[PDB]
From a paper:
Here, we identified three N-methyltransferases involved in the biosynthesis of caffeine from the leaves of Kucha. Combined with enzymatic study and kinetic analysis, we found that one of the N-methyltransferases, CkTcS, serves as the critical N9-methyltransferase, which only acts on 1,3,7-trimethyluric acid but not caffeine, indicating that C8-oxidation must take place prior to N9-methylation. The structural characterization of CkTcS identified key residues around the substrate binding pocket that are critical for N9-methyltransferse activity. A previous study using 14C labeled caffeine has confirmed that theacrine is biosynthesized from caffeine, possibly initiated by oxidation at C8 to yield the intermediate 1,3,7-trimethyluric acid followed by N9-methylation.
We next asked why CkTcS prefers 5, given the fact that it shares a sequence identity >90% with [name] and CkCS. We tried to solve the structure of [name] and CkCS in the presence of SAH and their corresponding substrates, but only crystallized [name]. Unfortunately, the N-terminal cap domain of [name] is disordered due to crystal packing. We finally solved the structure of [name] in apo form. However, when overlapping the [name] and CkTcS structures, most residues lining the substrate binding pockets are in the same orientation, suggesting that substrate binding does not induce large conformational changes in the methyltransferase domain. The substrate specificity of CkTcS proteins might be determined by minor variable residues which subtly tailor the chemical features of the core catalytic scaffold. Further observation identified three sequence-variable residues around the pocket: CkTcS_Arg-226 ([name]_His-226, CkCS_Arg-225), CkTcS_Ile-241 ([name]_Thr-241, CkCS_Thr-240), and CkTcS_Cys-270 ([name]_Ser-270, CkCS_Ser-269). In [name] and CkCS, Ile-241 is replaced by a threonine, and Cys-270 by a serine, both of which contain hydrophilic side-chains that may introduce extra direct or water-mediated hydrogen-bond and influence substrate binding. Consistently, [name] H226R mutation led to an apparent increase of N9-methylation activity towards 5. Single mutation of T241I or C270S on [name] led to a moderate increase in reaction products, while the double and triple mutations further increased the N-methyltransferase activity to almost half of that of CkTcS.
Author numbering:
A (entry chain B): 29 to 104, 106 to 370
B (entry chain A): 28 to 68, 71 to 106, 125 to 369
The structure:
């Protein structure tokens, strides 16, 4: 739903990044090597790979040389990528019309560190993965940091300055780790198309920046007051995720020397299906998406036998307390090129 | 898989001799070495450590930067020197899996003998099944069967070789191990004991009215156990690879270090059921499988006194030609 809208918004940035690769004759290499990192997109992963497939086919059809092939690395691969495998594998598709063969591989492991040999990647795509951290900020998980962000699970208006500082610091570290890892693996002049969950305002405590996590904390606090969750637990737990601003992303990429910013863009989208007339169906659909992306870290924290009652309260807060309206979600599009190198 | 365990110890010398022959050429100071395990089924995780161990030794002798190792795994069923990255490759190994010129090494153990399908031409005209009472080449079976089977294996193995030809780099190495046979006649008990016995078990249930004969008569396994000569000829017909070594070795089929025949027979049947039931179950259901391998075990433990012929494995070492 929302994911679909984000994916289409980033598609032109993906096209141009392929175009730039062509201007450096990447289409004349024996094979183009593409990776999709954090394949949790996705469904929307099929569109981006089909798009690379198609742009190569258009480019190479007038070339006298033997037609280049496409090698696709998919990471997150949980064996459910079979729908993408069967849809993109040119041997499985069996289309004799296609001149560009596509070979699809699974890459196990974390997008945070190394996944491939040196100079093995020409193009990296990653959508809504890079804002995830390796852990809750270290300054928040020390013996005395467990006390800083009391009734919440993320940067909030109630958070002392140390909280957002810790998060930015953790992001700086984890994102630089990523950049460093990719820098080893992305070929000189290679491209990277990153899309992530960010924010508009410079202040992270702003609702538009934190609403999803703020509302979840309010829901957890409800069950806490009702005596169903230990609060222990609320006060010591913080989310392993950060939504940076444009400026923060720029800063970190520029401090790291490895990549050049070809494109840095933010854009806003509605956070719920505003075309939906049923105020309950609107929030329920939103909550379902939220649950799909957040239940792993959350149920791990509070147990699974409380996830139903928890996400129900979350939906009730969205529907009733907020009249099925939320601030708009900001997404960041970051296109990078590996410097030579 | 205590049997497989013994097979991989015997082919590991032939794996070392071959991987090291990729160090005689250079082929020594490259960025990253790409190796594929095609039809994996812990031994695939053993051949990986072998490659890593060998590479690190040849580099420390050559005083050069250590390449990284990328391993591709196509599934059918701290102070380490060489950086290894492992990748999963879905898809059939009889077709293309990799870009051209991308593999330095290919390993495949006990997968190549599996056919893409049970042989095509097994019905006459008339309109009779050409392999009644059985599920593989047998003594009762007319010549047409073993010819259909060899033809199917010819086609399938040649497709494999053909695909690999595109992907294996010039002078790149292929190590293939497969279930073969000693005797030139593929209907010898040495060649087909497992399938023969399985048929005998099924035919027992048929006479008891538990399984249609329909059924037995129209089913045949998607497997073929070739001879050294058949393997050699097919490889030579295809023009892509050089036969560096081609050798067969014998192995005891049952755990013979066990005096209790019914125990060593069960162990055998348990093993046989693990790799044959998925091949058999579509045609005969899972329902009758308990009574099927029950009867199979009695045919093994009683009628043959837990004495089965040795299994022949073929070790095939290849090099890409240009």
């Amino acid at each position: 739903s929302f994911t679909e809208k984000v994916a289409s918004m980033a598609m032109p940035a993906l096209e141009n990044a392929v175009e730039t690769l062509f201007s450096k004759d990447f289409h004349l290499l024996p094979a183009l090597n593409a990776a999709d990192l954090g394949c949790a997109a996705g469904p929307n992963t099929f569109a981006v790979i089909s798009m690379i497939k198609r742009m190569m086919e258009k480019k190479c059809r007038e070339l006298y040389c033997q037609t280049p092939e496409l090698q696709v690395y998919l990471n997150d691969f949980g064996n459910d990528f079979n729908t993408l495998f069967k849809g993109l594998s040119s041997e499985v598709v069996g289309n004799k019309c296609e001149e560009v063969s596509c070979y699809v591989m699974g890459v196990p492991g974390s997008f945070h560190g190394r996944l491939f040999p040196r100079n093995s990647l020409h193009l990296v795509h990653s959508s809504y993965s890079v804002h995830w951290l390796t852990q809750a900020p270290k300054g928040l998980t020390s013996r005395e940091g467990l006390a800083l962000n009391k009734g919440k699970i993320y940067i909030s208006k109630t958070s002392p300055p140390a909280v957002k500082e810790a998060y930015l610091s953790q992001f700086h570290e984890d994102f630089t780790m990523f950049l460093n890892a990719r820098s080893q693996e992305v070929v000189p002049n290679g491209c990277m198309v990153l899309i992530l969950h960010g924010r508009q305002s410079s202040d992270p405590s702003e609702m538009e920046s934190c609403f999803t996590w703020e509302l979840l904390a309010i829901a957890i606090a409800e069950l806490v007051s009702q005596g169903l969750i230990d609060e222990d637990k609320l006060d010591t737990f913080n989310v392993p995720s950060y939504f940076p601003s444009l400026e923060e992303v720029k800063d970190i990429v520029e401090r790291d020397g490895s990549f050049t910013i070809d494109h840095l863009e933010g854009f806003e989208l509605d956070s719920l299906e505003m075309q939906e007339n049923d105020k309950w169906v609107r929030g329920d659909k939103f909550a379902k998406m939220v649950r799909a992306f957040t239940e792993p870290i959350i149920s791990n924290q509070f147990g699974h036998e409380i996830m139903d009652k928890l996400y129900d309260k979350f939906t009730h807060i969205v529907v009733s307390d907020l009249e099925a309206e939320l601030p708009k979600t900001t997404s960041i599009i970051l296109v990078l090129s590996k410097i030579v190198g």
